[PDB]
Structures are given as C-alpha cells and as structure tokens.
Subunit: 175 residues, 3 copies
Amino acid sequence: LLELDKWASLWNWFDITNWLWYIRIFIIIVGSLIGLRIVFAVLSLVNRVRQGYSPLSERDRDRSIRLVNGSLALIWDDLRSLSLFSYHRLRDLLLIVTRIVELLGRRGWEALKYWWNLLQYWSQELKNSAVSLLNATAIAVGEGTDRVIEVVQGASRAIRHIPRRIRQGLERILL
Amino acid sequence: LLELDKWASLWNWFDITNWLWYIRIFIIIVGSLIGLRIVFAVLSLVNRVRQGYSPLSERDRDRSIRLVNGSLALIWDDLRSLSLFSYHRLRDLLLIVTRIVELLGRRGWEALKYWWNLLQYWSQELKNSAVSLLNATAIAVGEGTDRVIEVVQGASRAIRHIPRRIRQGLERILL
Amino acid sequence: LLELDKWASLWNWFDITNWLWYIRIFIIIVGSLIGLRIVFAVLSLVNRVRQGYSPLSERDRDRSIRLVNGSLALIWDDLRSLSLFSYHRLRDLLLIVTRIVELLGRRGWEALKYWWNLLQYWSQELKNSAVSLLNATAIAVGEGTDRVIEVVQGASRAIRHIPRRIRQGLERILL
C-alpha cells in the first residue's frame, strides 16, 4: 500500500509524473498569478479605451500598441506623484498618507447613517404590501378589524421612521 | 523513486523542511487572496484617473487616497442601484432584473449580425489579393484566362452574399 | 520514522484526507477561479458609471444588465481594431504590428531618459538633508566649521554633475 510501490509504479506515466512532481513549482506561479492580476487592472483601462467607459453596448488599436512603449511614459505619471511639484517633499510625502486616515476615522461613521435609514425604508415596503392584503382580508370578518392591522403596522414603522442624529452625537463622543 | 530516510533527512537541512510544511498550509490562504481581487476592480477606476486617459501614454496620489473615503460612498452607490427610483422597487428589483433579461435577450442576437459581416468582408479581401496575383500569372500563357479567373472568383463571392437583415429574417422566421 | 502503515491508518479519517489528497486538484480549480476573475476587469468599466467617476467616493444599472448584450457589442470594439473600417487592412494587420513596434522601438528608450534626471534630483534631496543637519550641528563650534562643511559637501556633489545623455548619443550616433 502506498510508498515506493505506489510512487515507483507512477514513473510509467512519465508525462503526468512531471506534472505530479513539478506541481509544487507550478503552485508558486499560480499564487503569483493573482498578484500579476493586480497589474491586469491597467488592462481594464485599455479595455475602457477600446470598448468605451459606458457598458460594452476603432482608433484605440494604434494608440493601444503605444502601451508597449508605455514603459517610457510609465515613469512620467508616477514620478511627479511621490515628490509633487517640489523637492525635499519626497521623504515628507509618505507622512501625508497617515493624515487622511486619521481625519477619515471621524467622518467614516457615514457607514451607520445610511445603514439604519436604508434598512428602515425596506421594512416600510414590507409593511405596505402586508397592509394591502391584511386590510383587504380583515373586511371578510368585519367589526372594522382591518383598521386594527393598519394602526399597529403604522405605529411601529412610523415611530422608528424618524430617529435621533446618532451619527452626529457619536461623532463628537468618539473623537 | 521516493525514499523513507529522505523525509527524515530533510530534518538535517537546518530549516528547508519549514518551506514544505508551511507553504502547503499557505496555499489555502492563497485561495483567499484571489477572492481579495474583487475589491481591486475599484482600483482600476483610480488607475484611469491616474493614467491620464489613453492606455499608459501626480496629484492623483492624494485623490486616489480618497479611495479610502469609499466606505461612506459605498452605501450611496448600492442604495440608488438596489431599489432605484420610487421605493416599492426593492422587491421589484428581483422582478425587473429577471424581466429585463427577456426583453434584452431578443436584441442580443446582434452578436451573429456582425459575425455574418466578419466573414463577408474577409471573403472580399481574399478576392482582392487572390484575383490580383492569379489575374497576372494567368495571362503568361496567352489570352483568354483573364475572363475565367475574374469571373469564377468574383462570381462565387458575389452570389454567396447579397441579402441583409440576417437576424431580422432568422429571429422572426422562428415563429 | 515514516511507513506505509502510518498513511493507511489515516484512511480511517475519511473526511480531512480528501483535502489532503485533492488539494493538488484544488489549486488547479483555484487557477480556473482566478482566470474567471479577469472578467471582473470589465466590472470596473461599469463601476465608472454605476459606482461614480472617481474611485469609490445613476440609472445605468439598467445598462449594467445590457452587459449581457455585451456579446453583441463586443464584436464592435474588437472588429474595428484588427480590420478597421478602411478594410483591406486585415492582411495588413499582421504586417502593421511589426511596423508600429519597429517605428516606436527607436524612441521608446526614453524610459532610460527619465530615470537619469529622476535619480539625479533624488540624490539632490539627500544632499540637502545631510548638509543642513550636519552643518547646523557643527555650527555650535567656532573656528570655521560652517564654511568648510557647506563648501566641501556642496562642491563635491554639485561638481559631480556630468551630462551623459544616453538617449542623445543613441539618437544621433546610432544612425
């Protein structure tokens, strides 16, 4: 079972054996390929020129070939970004990066403002559909029971419809 | 063939073994890395901004940094896309998404429309190269070949392609 | 140390072993998973309109569904690049590729050009940092530390400037 007997018998599949023993080599390239894909993001820019910014629904090839030559241009877009229109700035510029992240931690709360309001309107639509069927089916009974289904539904969503400024209050208490 | 003592022999390689029994676990992590790439698609947007306009041929680092601001923005793009117009749309979105495909699928056949055209012109381009060369070598024998060479080649392409509206006749005749 | 008896015992653990003996297959599936990922690059095109102009910080979602129709449209962006509207170009398309690369290949070397000036100023920022800090600390002492430090540092680095434009000599002398 297994061992030299299983491994040795495989040497007859010389072609496949190569893949079986050299796969480990291949795994590294596969992991590398996702990283290579990061460079592929530039390719979408090429796709934009070829297909147009709007959905996929001519001249681009001649210029697109310039992408090969893009190696020369490629130092131009990136070169001015790190040091900007001034020198001595290059060492100082990396520190700027910390500045936006510190400032953004304060305004980042916009996550919660929309999520509470967003879930709030969806719930309202659920109640509206239910109000239609519930109001209509309640009449079969009588005694104005349908009026009861409307008030209860309207009471819970409506009261929760307009809450307090949790983003503002929490923004000042968090920083 | 493999070996038993080789497995134990690797223990004497100081720490080479560390690569084998760690990279293997590391592979599962790589699988996670691919699912990481979907967010990278937003990076391509930043790239077109940082790339000027055309394929590959400064301040954009600070603005691209604004990509971090995408957290607050993220509820906004999803919010108008998910329901879009009015507000009874969120449940409707499941209906309209399915329903649009049927309406849109009808015009989608235009794929074939151009493909019919691809074969149509290349056929014509073949005639120009072939007729020119064959027309010239044909006369080398005498006088009378020029009519058969031009009439036979031009005749086959000429009668094989003339009617238009391929999808119009094809898509409707299927009823 | 090891033995086929140790491996066989693991067969009674019919659960995890599948991963252990199918991970080789798993990376291949992952490879396919990542190639599939490339289509996401078009999503960025949609992101511009659907997700806003700049990075992450309209109605076209209806158009996002038209992406299905993108098969119809997809021949329009591509068909014009190989053959172009001029036509007769299609056989030319294979030849032109050599001409544009041959033509652009001569001036394409300017990549090296930017690197020479680019690195040149970077050396200059480092030079200013050392002189300012070292001279300023040396000023604490009298005698004449200020004159020697600023003159010798600035004299050696500044005078070391030598214009050896490779591109210049490559354009005029390579003919």
